[PDB]
Amino acid sequence: MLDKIVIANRGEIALRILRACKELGIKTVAVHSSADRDLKHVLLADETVCIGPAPSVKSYLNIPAIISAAEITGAVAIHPGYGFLSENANFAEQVERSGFIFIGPKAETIRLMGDKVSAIAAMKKAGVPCVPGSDGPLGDDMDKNRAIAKRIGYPVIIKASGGGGGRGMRVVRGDAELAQSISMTRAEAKAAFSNDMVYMEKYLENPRHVEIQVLADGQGNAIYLAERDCSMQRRHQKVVEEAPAPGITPELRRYIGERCAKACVDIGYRGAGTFEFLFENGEFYFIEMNTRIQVEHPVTEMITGVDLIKEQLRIAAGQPLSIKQEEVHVRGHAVECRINAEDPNTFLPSPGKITRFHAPGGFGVRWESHIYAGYTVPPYYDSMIGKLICYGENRDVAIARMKNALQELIIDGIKTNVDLQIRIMNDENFQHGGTNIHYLEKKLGLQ
Amino acid sequence: GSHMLDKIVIANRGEIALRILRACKELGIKTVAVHSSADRDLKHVLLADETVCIGPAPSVKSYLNIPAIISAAEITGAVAIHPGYGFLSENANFAEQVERSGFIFIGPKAETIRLMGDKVSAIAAMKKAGVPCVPGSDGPLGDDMDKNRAIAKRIGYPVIIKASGGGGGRGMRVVRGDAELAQSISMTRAEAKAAFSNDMVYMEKYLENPRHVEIQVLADGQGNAIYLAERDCSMQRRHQKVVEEAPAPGITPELRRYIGERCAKACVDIGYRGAGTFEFLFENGEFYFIEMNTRIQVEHPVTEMITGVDLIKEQLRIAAGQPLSIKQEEVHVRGHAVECRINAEDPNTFLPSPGKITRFHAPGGFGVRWESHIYAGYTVPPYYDSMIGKLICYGENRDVAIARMKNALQELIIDGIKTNVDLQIRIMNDENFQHGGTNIHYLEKKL
Ligand SMILES: Nc1ncnc2c1ncn2[C@@H]1O[C@H](COP(=O)(O)OP(=O)(O)O)[C@@H](O)[C@H]1O
Ligand SMILES: Nc1ncnc2c1ncn2[C@@H]1O[C@H](COP(=O)(O)OP(=O)(O)O)[C@@H](O)[C@H]1O
Ligand SMILES: Nc1ncnc2c1ncn2[C@@H]1O[C@H](COP(=O)(O)OP(=O)(O)O)[C@@H](O)[C@H]1O
Ligand SMILES: Nc1ncnc2c1ncn2[C@@H]1O[C@H](COP(=O)(O)OP(=O)(O)O)[C@@H](O)[C@H]1O
Ligand SMILES: [Mg+2]
Ligand SMILES: [Mg+2]
């Protein structure tokens, strides 16, 4: 019944969604900005509609233009991908009210779980352990704020409730920096996400980032698809993700997986989502839920055989999961390296025209990207231009294949992080596995 | 497990040389690329640790230059040579010379190449082993036409003349009656002598309605052997394969086990070592042996997708003296995979299309695998086979595999030369291919 869907996104994820539609005989409508007319998926799409000028605020965040596009092409559903309006409760409400299927959760669920402050409360209520913190928004009373920081114990982190992508988070190591770190985060969050709401959380020094993939049909069925380790980070943003997570025992996998599946049923969750945790000394601590598909979804696909984009579409078309928990089986290992148009050392954005391009191939090699020779990477958007995912019968083979595939990958004409990713694959501690969320920056000697 | 071979010479070119190169690099084996003077810019040559030019462009002077190839191993201090497919891979003289010079032939023992590689000797052995063959001259044809007419009378007059030392569909002519017989034997002998340096021909009954079904084997040479399902390769032009798939449609679990066990038994009985394929004509529920490839095959990736076994790595493990790791009961068929060969030829007149590839884009996505050395800027030489790449698509079922293939072929861009991409698109759209079980004559009849 999903004859035509609007892909409310761009770049690599838009192409990912397009491919899934194409395989399923579903008509595609590519909505794009005036800077994105030459996107790969825009050229492969059945229909195209320019929804605004180059800036995201004036295009991909343009709610009325996106709905109008669905309206005028007579689409039935809208896939928001990740970022942009995918976790915008207002968007979902309006799409559904306009008579279109929103390929994601109900808006009440987006507001419960997509907003971080409310998410933590709902998880402390439902029987999921969280990181000790302010357990509410922070007020302007700075004596009250200091008491909190003393309860949980420095270092602490100030986090934006409406934040994402590593934005709106500042680490506080003592009272001397607390007032100004709160103020600057409120400001950064206000200008980046609207919402100036911030809370306080204990800053964990030695955890790993372990996240649990879930699918739920909104009819009372909910499964978990093992986990992903995403501990290799810079500026609180993921650089390498892998699945399964090393060193996670079957007893722990089942413990935490069942909690997340239970949480989904208890909240009536609908679609794909990810529960993100800080994992340290054998314990999981909930930090946030992404109520949407995630960038790193392919590594889970490769180890399970489950097509998560197709599953999202199954759920949106009103069909229950026909995958049961005992039918989920992990085989092998997959690693994903994000490819970013940025300086390999300074990490400042590198827009420009790609003058030469060559993609890697081979058994277990999966290249996810819209880039091509002669494609100009625009300055307006996130720097991630592609994803390289390698699968292998085991983790050593996955990493060996990634080294090989990074050696084949050519992207000339702009700076990229390919050199960085080769360095990480060659890191003896990454090869042993289980490095923490602070490792990459420590290795790079980043003050 | 034991240490891998330190260093190998890859004694081939094109897509199979790159495939072997990738396997070496995952296993930490150093690579030596021997190449002709026309192949300096091959992708695997550009990736190889060491390169040696073994002669000028013509294959006779380079990839068939036995002493140059062996000398190359010695100069680089390689310990083994992998012959790929074609060229010297089923040349028993080469395998002997390789061993007598102190290197490992990553292949069967030379004795086994003579027994099973030669088509006349292989028919004889299999018949003595109690393996059904196609009725035929059961011996080389001589020069007196009365005796040759008499053999055709016995078996029945669609007959085919086949070169004992032939391969790639070459050195084969169908004969409909007496009038054509003398000239057909004569032309087949002359073609064989020029192509394979062996003018030996035999006569076989020409089967009207069979499918091409072949069984993958893997033997450690120590007495253990397994099979890895079957492949159907019935879509052919000039008796050479165009599309391959695995598993073969209409082959049951019970039937697969029947033929697989017999092939595995045959390996133990003849002392086979390495990867191999037994090729059958499958007609009226019965298998009839036609040949054994005593080497890796072009289409090995379809079997890898549906079994998870890395056939090249297994070749290298076995050549390192490792016994088979994989037991028969560990081998499981999952899903379905299709391969479309990509050839630089006119899609309609099949005229060779050498030249510079000016634009190139590989297909990507879940379940899509691309096996090719080609790149934008690369010149396809006129000296060698037209096959420039292989596209392989996997799905949870055959319908999914075929829809994915369609889409992948549509994404593929190769400008500058003519290719058969458009024929493969016609084939995926063919109602009878979609049905399955089309016979070996279908593609040419469709045309
Ligand atoms: N709440 C949000 N609002 C707007 N954009 C977001 C939000 N969360 C994430 N994004 C954006 O979506 C993209 C993917 O986010 P990222 O955190 O890199 O991946 P993931 O969370 O899927 O692992 C980034 O460009 C990021 O800035
Ligand atoms: N309490 C904490 N202690 C230590 N690190 C944290 C904490 N909260 C977040 N982080 C760091 O920031 C990363 C992203 O956290 P998250 O809350 O999911 O932010 P985002 O919304 O940007 O995805 C984590 O992987 C971790 O490295
Ligand atoms: N006995 C042989 N002598 C020389 N070349 C061969 C021989 N057998 C196969 N080839 C070549 O090897 C390549 C692969 O053979 P082909 O028949 O296409 O694949 P396969 O038999 O692996 O399915 C082709 O170029 C073919 O011409
Ligand atoms: N007896 C036969 N009757 C009909 N077709 C045949 C026969 N033998 C071979 N062929 C056709 O030629 C193809 C190649 O046969 P094969 O002996 O494997 O030659 P090659 O060494 O060239 O691979 C087969 O797949 C089949 O389609
Ligand atoms: Mg997060
Ligand atoms: Mg053959």
- For residue A82, give the ligand nearest its CA: 1
CA atoms in the 13 A half-sphere facing the CB of A437: 20
Protein residues placing their CB within 5 Å of the ion ligand 6? B 279
Burial of residue A397 (CB within 10 Å: 0-12, 13-18, 19+) is buried
What is the rounded distance in angstroms from the CA atom of residue A295 to the CA atom of residue A302? 14
Contact A362, A299 (CB under 8 A): no
Chain A residue nearest residue B366, CA to CA: A366
Catalytic residue among B256, B295, B317, B404: B295
Burial class (CB in 10 A: 0-12, 13-18, 19+), B183: exposed
Q: What CATH number is associated with residue B292?
A: 3.30.470.20
Interatomic CA distance for residues A364 and A351, integer angstroms: 30
Q: How far is B214 from chain A (nearest CA, A)?
A: 22
Q: Which run of H or of E encompasses B14?
A: helix B14-26
| Nearest residue by C-alpha to atom 12 in ligand 1 | A83
In angstroms, rounded to a whole number, what is the distance separating the alpha carbons of residues B160 and B169? Answer: 12
φ, ψ for residue A309, nearest 5 deg: -65, -50
CA of B169 to the centre of ligand 3 (A): 8
Cβ-proximal residues to A156 (8 Å cutoff; 6+ apart), any chain: A133, A148, A149, A171, A172, A200, A201, A202, A203
Of how many residues is chain B composed?
447
Are B362 and A367 a contacting pair at CB < 8 A? yes
User: What are phi and psi for residue A412, nearest 5 degrees?
Assistant: -100, 150
Other CB atoms closer than 10 Å to residue B279's CB: what's the count?
18
Read off the amino acid at residue B377. G
- Flag whether residue A170 sits within 8 Å of chain B, measured between CB atoms: no
A316 with A175, same domain? no
Residue whose CB lies within 8 A of the most ligand 1 atoms, among A13, A59, A82, for a mutation test: A82
Whether residues A367 and B369 touch (CB distance < 8 A) is answered with no
When computed from its CA atoms, the radius of gyration of chain A, rounded to whole angstroms, is 21
> Quick one: A347 and A421 in the same domain?
yes
- Say which CATH number the domain at A188 has: 3.30.1490.20
Query: The CATH number of the domain where A56 resides is what?
Result: 3.40.50.20
| DSSP-derived pairing of the beta strands B7-10 and A376-377 | unpaired
Of A158, A182, A203, which one is at a domain's C-terminal end? A203
Are B399 and B310 found together in one domain? yes
* DSSP assignment string, A296-349: THHHHHHHH---HHHHHHHHHTTPPP---GGG----SEEEEEEEESB-TTT--B
Nearest C-alpha in B relative to A370: B364
Residues of chain A in contact with residue B19, where contact means CB-CB under 8 angstroms, are 362
CA–CA distances in Å: residue B200 to residues B172, B187, B427: 12, 12, 35
| B276 and B154 inside one domain | no
Q: Could you tell me which residues are beta bridge partners of residue B391? A: B340, B370
DSSP H or E segment with residue B337: strand B336-343
Give the C-alpha separation, B427 to B302, whole Å.
Answer: 17
Q: Which of B237, B229, B105 has its CA nearest to residue B168?
A: B237
Cα A53 to its chain centre, rounded Å, is 25
Instruction: Look at strands B80-82 and B7-10 and give their pairing.
Output: parallel
Tokens of A199: 């809370």
Residues contacting ligand 4 via CB (< 6 Å): B 134, 160, 162, 166-169, 204-207, 212, 236, 239, 279, 290-291, 440
**Are residues B276 and B341 located together in one domain of the fold?**
yes
Residues of A in contact with B388 (CB under 8 A): none
Domain co-membership, A224 together with A260: yes
φ, ψ (nearest 5 deg) of residue B343: -125, 145
B100 is catalytic: no
Q: Does A362 contact B369 at a Cβ distance shorter than 8 Å? A: yes
Which has the closest alpha carbon to B440: B279, B303, B292, B298?
Answer: B279
The beta strand positions in A190-327, using DSSP E, are 198-202, 208-217, 222-234, 237-243, 270-280, 283-290
Q: Where does a domain end: B156, B173, B206?
A: B206
CB-based contact (8 Å) between B15 and chain A?
no
Q: B227 phi and psi, to 5 degrees? A: -110, 155
SS3 B120: helix
Q: Are B14 and B384 in contact (CB under 8 A)?
A: yes
The alpha carbon dihedral of A421, A425, A426, A429 has a sign of positive
Strand duo B379-380 + B355-356: pairing:
antiparallel
Per-window interface: A 239-268 vs B, CB < 8 A: none
Residues of A annotated catalytic, as ranges = 292
Which residues on B lie below 8 Å from A26 (Cβ)? none
Closest alpha carbon to B20 in B277, B370, B310 = B310
Q: What is the DSSP letter of A435?
A: -
Distance, in Å, from the CA atom of B306 to the CA atom of B337, rounded to the nearest integer, reads 6
Q: Which residue has the tokens 């702009």?
A: A414
Q: State whether the beta carbon of B191 lies less than 6 angstroms from ligand 3.
A: no
Would you put residue A67 in left (φ > 0), alpha (ψ -120 to 50) or beta?
A: alpha
Q: Assess whether A191 and A333 both reside in one domain.
A: no
Other C-beta atoms lying within 10 Å of the C-beta of residue A171: 13
A430 Cβ under 8 Å from any chain B Cβ: no
Looking at the structure, do residues A225 and A267 belong to the same domain, yes or no?
yes
Nearest to B294 by CA among B417, B125, B162: B125
How far is the CA of A410 from the CAs of A363, A415, B82, B379, B389, in angstroms? Answer: 19, 11, 28, 18, 19
What beta strand segments (E) does B116-171 contain?
A: 159-163
CB contact under 8 A, B366 and A365: no
Query: In terms of domains, do B231 and B321 share one?
Result: yes
Alpha-carbon distance of A289 to A109, in angstroms, equals 11
Closest CA to A426 of A402, A394, A397: A402
Q: Does A329 touch chain B (CB under 8 A)?
A: no
Given A187, A203, A219, the domain boundary residue is A203
Same domain assignment for residues A189 and A283: no
Q: At A54, phi and psi to the nearest 5?
A: -60, -45
Residue B385 alpha carbon, nearest atom of ligand 3: 25
Give the pair of three-digit tokens for residue A321: 């999961």
Domain of residue A198 covers: 131-203
> Hey, is the C-beta of B361 within 8 angstroms of any chain A C-beta?
yes
Tell me: is residue A125 an annotated ligand-binding position. no
B22 CB neighbours in chain A (<8 A) are: 362-363, 401, 404
Report DSSP state, residue B345. B
- A138 with A277, same domain: the answer is no
How many other β-carbons are positioned within 10 Å of the β-carbon of residue B119? 23
**Eight-class DSSP state of A35:** T
- Give yes or no for a contact between B36 and B52, defined as CB atoms under 8 angstroms apart: no
User: Ligand 4 centroid vs B20 CA: distance in angstroms?
Assistant: 27
| CA–CA distance, B13 with B55 (Å, rounded to integer) | 13
Ligand nearest to the CA of A228: 1
User: Is A408 in Cβ contact with B47 (below 8 Å)?
Assistant: yes
Q: Is B121 on the interface with A (CB under 8 A)?
A: no
User: In this structure, which residue's CA is closest to atom 21 in ligand 4?
Assistant: B167
Q: CB A366 to CB B370 under 8 A? A: no
| Cα–Cα dist A242/A430, whole Å | 11
Interface contact flag, B404 A331, Cβ < 8 Å:
no
E strand intervals along B239-310: 240-241, 243-246, 273-283, 286-293
- What the block records as the tokens of A290 is 């992404």
Atom 23 of ligand 2 has which residue's CA nearest to it? Answer: A164
DSSP state of B3: P
Chain B neighbors of A367, CB-CB under 8 A: 362, 364
Give the Cα separation of A404 and B138 in Å (integer).
49
Q: Looking at the 3D structure of chain B, how many domains does it have? A: 3
Nearest Cα to Cα of residue B390 among B363, B359, B358, B354: B363
Region label for B153, one of left (φ > 0), alpha (ψ between -120 and 50) or beta (otherwise): alpha
Amino acid A62 reads: N
Q: Which ligand gives the minimal distance to the CA of A207?
A: 2
Element (H, E) at B228: strand B225-232
Helix, strand, coil share (%) of chain B residues, nearest 5: 35, 25, 40
A12-to-A309, A370, A380 alpha-carbon distances in Å: 13, 5, 15
Same domain, B41 and B139: no
Strand, coil or helix: B145:
helix
Angle at A58 between CA A52 and CA A59, to 5 degrees: 50
Which residues does chain B have within 8 Å of residue A365's beta carbon, measured at their own beta carbons?
A: 369
